[PDB]
Design an enzyme around this catalytic site. Sequence first.
Site, short mmCIF file in Angstrom:
data_model
loop_
_atom_site.label_atom_id
_atom_site.label_comp_id
_atom_site.label_asym_id
_atom_site.label_seq_id
_atom_site.Cartn_x
_atom_site.Cartn_y
_atom_site.Cartn_z
N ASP A 105 6.54 -7.66 2.98
CA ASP A 105 5.82 -8.20 4.10
C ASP A 105 4.64 -9.07 3.69
O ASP A 105 3.49 -8.61 3.57
CB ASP A 105 5.38 -7.10 5.07
CG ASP A 105 5.13 -7.66 6.44
OD1 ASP A 105 4.42 -8.68 6.55
OD2 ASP A 105 5.71 -7.12 7.41
N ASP A 111 -4.42 -2.02 7.66
CA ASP A 111 -2.99 -1.71 7.86
C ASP A 111 -2.77 -0.41 8.64
O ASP A 111 -1.67 -0.15 9.11
CB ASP A 111 -2.30 -1.52 6.51
CG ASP A 111 -2.07 -2.79 5.77
OD1 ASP A 111 -1.35 -3.65 6.29
OD2 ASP A 111 -2.57 -2.91 4.63
N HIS A 147 -4.95 -8.89 7.75
CA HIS A 147 -6.05 -8.82 6.80
C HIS A 147 -7.06 -9.95 6.97
O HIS A 147 -7.86 -10.20 6.06
CB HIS A 147 -5.53 -8.75 5.36
CG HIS A 147 -4.72 -7.53 5.05
ND1 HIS A 147 -5.26 -6.26 5.02
CD2 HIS A 147 -3.39 -7.38 4.81
CE1 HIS A 147 -4.30 -5.38 4.76
NE2 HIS A 147 -3.16 -6.03 4.61
N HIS A 151 2.47 -10.56 7.38
CA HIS A 151 1.34 -9.89 8.07
C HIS A 151 -0.02 -10.27 7.49
O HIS A 151 -1.06 -10.09 8.14
CB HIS A 151 1.50 -8.35 8.04
CG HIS A 151 1.04 -7.70 6.77
ND1 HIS A 151 1.71 -7.82 5.57
CD2 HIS A 151 0.00 -6.85 6.54
CE1 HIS A 151 1.06 -7.12 4.65
NE2 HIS A 151 0.03 -6.52 5.21
N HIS A 157 2.32 38.44 -10.21
CA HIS A 157 2.65 39.55 -11.11
C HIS A 157 2.52 39.20 -12.59
O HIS A 157 2.89 40.00 -13.41
CB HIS A 157 4.06 40.08 -10.82
CG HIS A 157 4.35 40.30 -9.37
ND1 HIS A 157 4.81 39.30 -8.54
CD2 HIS A 157 4.23 41.40 -8.60
CE1 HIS A 157 4.98 39.79 -7.33
NE2 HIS A 157 4.61 41.06 -7.33
#
EC number: 1.14.12.12
Lengths: 446, 446, 446, 192, 192, 192
Positions: free
Chosen positions: A205, A362, A213, A208, A104
């Site tokens: 982390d 990941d 990786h 990992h 509007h």
Amino acid sequence: MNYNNKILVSESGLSQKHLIHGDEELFQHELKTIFARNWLFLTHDSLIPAPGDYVTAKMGIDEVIVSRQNDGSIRAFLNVCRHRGKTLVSVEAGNAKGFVCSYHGWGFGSNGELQSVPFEKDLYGESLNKKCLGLKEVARVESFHGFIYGCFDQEAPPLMDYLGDAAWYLEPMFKHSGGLELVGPPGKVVIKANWKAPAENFVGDAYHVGWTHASSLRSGESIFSSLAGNAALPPEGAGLQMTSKYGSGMGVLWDGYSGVHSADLVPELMAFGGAKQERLNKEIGDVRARIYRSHLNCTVFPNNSMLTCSGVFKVWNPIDANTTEVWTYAIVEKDMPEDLKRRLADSVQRTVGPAGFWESDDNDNMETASQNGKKYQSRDSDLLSNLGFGEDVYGDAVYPGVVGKSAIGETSYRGFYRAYQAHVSSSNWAEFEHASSTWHTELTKT
Amino acid sequence: MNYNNKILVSESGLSQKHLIHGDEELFQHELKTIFARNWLFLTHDSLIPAPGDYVTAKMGIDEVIVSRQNDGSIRAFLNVCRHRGKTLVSVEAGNAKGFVCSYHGWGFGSNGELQSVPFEKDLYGESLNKKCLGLKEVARVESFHGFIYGCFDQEAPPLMDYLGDAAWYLEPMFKHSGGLELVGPPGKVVIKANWKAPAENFVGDAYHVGWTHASSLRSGESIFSSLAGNAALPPEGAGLQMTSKYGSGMGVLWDGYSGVHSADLVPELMAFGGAKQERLNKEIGDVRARIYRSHLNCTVFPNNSMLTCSGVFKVWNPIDANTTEVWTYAIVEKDMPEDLKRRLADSVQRTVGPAGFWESDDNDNMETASQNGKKYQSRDSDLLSNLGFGEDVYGDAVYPGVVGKSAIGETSYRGFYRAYQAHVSSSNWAEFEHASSTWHTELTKT
Amino acid sequence: MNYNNKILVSESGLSQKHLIHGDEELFQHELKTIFARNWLFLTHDSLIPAPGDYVTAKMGIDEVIVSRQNDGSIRAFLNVCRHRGKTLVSVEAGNAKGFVCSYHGWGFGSNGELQSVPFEKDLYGESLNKKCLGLKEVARVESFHGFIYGCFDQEAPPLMDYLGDAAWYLEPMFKHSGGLELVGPPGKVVIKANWKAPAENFVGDAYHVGWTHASSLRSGESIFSSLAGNAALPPEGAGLQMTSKYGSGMGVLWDGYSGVHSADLVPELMAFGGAKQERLNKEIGDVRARIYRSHLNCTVFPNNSMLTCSGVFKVWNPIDANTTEVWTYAIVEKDMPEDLKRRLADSVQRTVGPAGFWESDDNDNMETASQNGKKYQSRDSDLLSNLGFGEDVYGDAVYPGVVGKSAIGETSYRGFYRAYQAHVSSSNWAEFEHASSTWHTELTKT
Amino acid sequence: INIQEDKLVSAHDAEEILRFFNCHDSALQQEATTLLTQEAHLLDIQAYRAWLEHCVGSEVQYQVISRELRAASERRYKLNEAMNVYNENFQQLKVRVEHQLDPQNWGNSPKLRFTRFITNVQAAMDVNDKELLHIRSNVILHRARRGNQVDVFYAAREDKWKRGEGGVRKLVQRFVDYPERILQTHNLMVFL
Amino acid sequence: INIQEDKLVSAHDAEEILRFFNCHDSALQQEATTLLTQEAHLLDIQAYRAWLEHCVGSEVQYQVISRELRAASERRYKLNEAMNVYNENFQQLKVRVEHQLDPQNWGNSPKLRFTRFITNVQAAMDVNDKELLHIRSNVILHRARRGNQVDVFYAAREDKWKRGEGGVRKLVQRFVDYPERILQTHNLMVFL
Amino acid sequence: INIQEDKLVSAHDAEEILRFFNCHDSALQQEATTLLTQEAHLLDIQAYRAWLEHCVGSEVQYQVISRELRAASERRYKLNEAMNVYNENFQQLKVRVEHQLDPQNWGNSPKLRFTRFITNVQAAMDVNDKELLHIRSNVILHRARRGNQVDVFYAAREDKWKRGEGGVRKLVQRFVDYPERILQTHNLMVFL
Ligand code: FES
Ligand code: FES
Ligand code: FES
Ligand SMILES: [Fe+3]
Ligand SMILES: [Fe+3]
Ligand SMILES: [Fe+3]
């Protein structure tokens, strides 16, 4: 579920119920007790430098307009018209004095005020109290060295206090380096994971990295490349872990200034970081100048993560218990040469952006871990975060916060989840504070 | 909904509330009272014959790893790492001594034990109690002539007792034929139906065949082809129906050894089945040797179905109230010539596999019947299963179980749903038993 | 949420909680208190003129078969087989004496009765009480000048009474014009909006037209084209707004007989409408003959909307809180030349059909307004409908209902939402009536 | 291709590359494109009898497999690697066509809608059988029915075509290794 | 094209139209179609080393951008309009290929399935560099993995190809402006 | 095709088969492919005025229908079988183009992204009007907007093209029978 009583995170943050990554009722509860309560990343000065510059951002599932005011301050408002609730702004960034609704035609200022209504005189006469019809404003907006955060809860601690012991670690890069710029626009991708999965991974982390990786480490030739396939554990004293009262935490990997960047950028970066460190020794001391050029993997609770030196800046925007919209920016040091800034930004996206080959490693980890939280036999199972427990310290003479003096552990998981549980079981900030009055004692038991 | 009191299935199994095929809260309740309680099909000896062979399987919405141990036994475990809950195995079948998690590299044996953790000495020291961190094991794993079933509930009846009166009918083909082999891999397709729709259809629905499958009957030239378009009712004494205490049931169509197989296989099959029957008369008696070469449409409660002689083996894997993942194997007699086994397997998939022209006929039936259970005016409506009620017997001198001595009826629906209702309204096996102490009396009223 | 107490719509209909467009629990509640209670559009005589003609239609989320009986009446039935609940009819329209289910072959008459069951004698004997197994019938089916509506609730007011003061406005076009025909088949498109968003827009929203439809107004050259971009407010006395006890309402734009139609049709339409008006002056009086050729934007509560003169007829079929299936028909005057009828029908679809360039302008308005009702910071926010409040009248000597004597306002929103709130908080029609005994007083306060 | 170096490449896939990288006959590529476009047109309008008569050789094998998901490093587990979604001779295709055309095929009313998109056409004559034409192509197949059901299929097709009755080239083998292991299209009841 | 009249058209887009509407060389269109079909075939079978050797020039720039959503009428805000999802030289492509082929790329087991659909090929020689070939084409790329994951990518590609070693035409530039701002495919880890 | 035997085939569909199975003129197929690829390119970059000027004949009928779902065996019910999603003459197309280009078309900011995939091109000259070219083709049309909205359209197009001003072939009729009865793409506001 009774969130006052349900033990979702065990004492000392040692484990969490797997359902926290899958339960939609809990996700809805987090909108109230996590996202409506805590500080959330909005933008950087560098993206809205001039009066009238604006961006849109998410805060939890809500969308906000974040606007540079004429007086140089920043205000943020719900991206929702006060009339019939249409989304006001459909673009991601721009410059304007105001925002007109396409339904509007109501016109709002950059300051959120309702400035005009079509045919106001003929239609409303004097009856429309425009002063009460400004956009719904984000109660708190504060800056940490150009990084702008918002909070819907007026009762929150100041941003600086909220960062707690994490701030000390960030300051060498965020402040003493001469400052950082955020390079936009971000990459944006949806992943089928709970927002906590990447948040926990970035906060704490390191374990990992060598396994998850392996292929990216081997293929990219980055500075951390000896880790591929768990071929080599980082040496003694290679880093530390920290956490803080309000949940923010990080890992520190000493000297890793080139981070995930492939061998093409390593020599240039290691030269640049080393040169600045030599200057900073005199200004902030050897330890903090070393922290400046050390790789920090940090989560600013709840859902903003970063890798300093790699120059990665992430927002894990929640959609539902198994859906998250990932925003990826590059962060660069303002005084770097422009050509290096450009190459660094491209390298951030190359590694962790929408086609980021590292971040791709990941995906399955975070998606399946999240989706398993919905599975019947796993809901009441315990996710473990006990690595390094009983070896953390608090009040160290050199390194503040709850600290694990080892590169790899789960110290930062424990602090993250301790804060999470304290929020989920509390109705307001006062209750969180009461629930957190022995936070570091809890984390350093045994 | 109060499942202790809500009458979802009426007395004698005569009707069911349509909402049972649509209600998501009930689906979640079934995960507990049906799938976590009852025996569920996993695999066959023929798919994991050697030490270290494994497959993945679903049990309800959970995924398990099913592994042949060195001692020849089979154990099954949740496909979920005990560390941060990542899915451990991403393949459907293989051979391995163990399973390494791709997140942080934890290594589990084929026996579920946590065998290694990267850098355990440096990271955990002696603090990790690996003995308590084995994969979550399926409590019960048992075999029925090479067909391997699992049950999460230690309190379940032995598989043989659970099959009840159905076992007597299956033994001629499963045992006395010399044994069956499962031919993998299965076809896998998602249908927009509740798992109960195909389960009920296979357990007890001969009535639909002539009308639903008119085109497949007419086009394929199978042995049951006179039924097309309800052109002909099976004659007097063409078969029977049975059901059992724990919900399993089947139809028996006398002599229909070639089943759904198109005329190309009919003569060869009818010769092979007849030859074996002649030998079995002497060993197990004429009636049971005839059952061997008679077509059985069976559901092993809750969600495993089969057509003996056609050689179809199905798992109706639940996803949500209107989504089911259909797994389709072929079953063959071990002593058939290899070339016939190959052609039979292809014919199973041709007829009822992912492009199975017969099974395609059933799709709309099961999908719309399920989806209508969500519609407001249908939720409280009654699905009818009264065909043949008042004519069933129990304790017959020749045919055991609750038996309808007619080829076409709803006897097996009633037994299926009686067991279902007894589980849904019970908290454990003891309560199911108490709820089932007059099971056959209930089914044979009037 | 306690719907007896929760104020979802404020007094006088002045505002509504934004959550009403997003909340799925409320959507489920509306299935009971709105859709199962109120009159819903089914079809027109013109689409099922002959005995045995039928169409399928939605009533809320339920699907019905609507069938012309041999005696000329119309009956409607759930499109769900009484046996195992399969959808009976899979087509949108046809002609038949009955409907056979493709699952087991049960045959129902056009009158809903169960007429045959395959092999009834052999299978059921005399035991099947077919008289009790007819399709579930829609309790109430009534006509408004050929437009057929249904209601599941036997206690509803007659359709004519339900239309209340709206009927007076519709009669010149629906009755005195010689009658209307519905031109099928409809366009069908799914939009990601709550059904109330288009319903409210059609019932009462003239304010949006100049701004939302700026490009369509400018490009199409329609009769209302001076409004583009809010370049010009309609003059004094250009129209009015009305609402009624049971929630139906409309806007009236005097003389706008060519409506949204592009300049290609304007002269022909303005001639045709004017000619008929001249004849109607003598029959129904100047005011009502003028209403005949005036553009009415109406919603027949809850979810049927229309634009007379433009010749648009819409059903907003609910799917979930943010999904609606939009059905678009054309309405034409029976005595128009066939070639004009054809061109009018095409022009309706051109403007507001599946590729309707006007309706495309509204998409983002309705979708984002609806989706914002799910967002945490907006759920408890107030959608405003106060334009013109304090200037409405009731019992006017010329124009009945609660009337705002201005072309642009929110009178009809207020009446719509007053009725909505009265239903949502009531368990039956008697309670709605008690909640509505001062309906017009409430709407005309201040 | 050296599959010892290109570690992700199957021996089968390497053999098929060699077939097309060798050939170039631009006119053959055009003939193949025509053949496949006409075949697809017949299928899209559900002229299944016409398809059998004009496009399918009496000696056809029409095969679509689904391969079990196995470890890339798997070397011990040796059981059946795949199942046949289709593995049809001409008579078996005819049964399927009759099932489609039967007026009591309830699932075919209202009539289905098919649209096929054929791309990446390659063609090479066989080295040894000079009358055998190898054609590779990819298909997107869109099936719509019953108002709101839409299924989209994606596949690569390895075909052999041979001149038959009247000198018309007809399909003598089609092989598809279906890329999605778990179908999310209700069934695979379409001719790829 | 007059972009003052055709208000929605970018200057860049108008320049590319002019390039192809001018050229017509039907043989070039055919050469380009072959080149792209062969490239796609190599990629689909995951012969990434073969792709590098046979299809990618040593001087390549392989670029895929994502453009920030800005107002059509925007004229003041001047900061970086786009980010690079890919912006790779040959060595950076090689790193990506090695990552794909590494036996510790856990996400590649079980093996992924790719199917590519290349359409709307246009080709024109450069005006100034007579050995530079401009090729435009659109791709649908279907990736399936792990039973029930399916991602479909859609893009237009603006390529430059040049004759290299052995006279083989190789890719020297690819530019894609990715049409979806927020990816709903998990990642964009595919070679468009 | 014998539609008494091929029971699922419409008379209309059988007529169109006959048109293309008869013709083969490989050069015409190539001309048609060019025409359609260029048209699609203009549309994809939103050069709607250029499209009107270069591709659309003054006498055009641009028609997309949606057919009501009826029983395959239906023979009594005779009311309007279809509605027109589009049924446009040149002036009506121009209105639509002006609506697209209007700077107050709020839904066009931020700018939309279109990608079109044209396949299965067939071309035949009309028997009676030697200057009328029949072209059939299929389209996949991908529309992306506002971060996370993606709509994909699938259709077969029956076109007539005729040489017009300057000898340029222009579209004089397009007919699409849209395959999905209930659209799940928000609207059909795209030029197929
Ligand atoms: S909804 Fe924004 S002006 Fe009305
Ligand atoms: S989640 Fe499996 S090793 Fe960490
Ligand atoms: S479900 Fe309709 S006849 Fe059985
Ligand atoms: Fe990582
Ligand atoms: Fe069946
Ligand atoms: Fe509108």
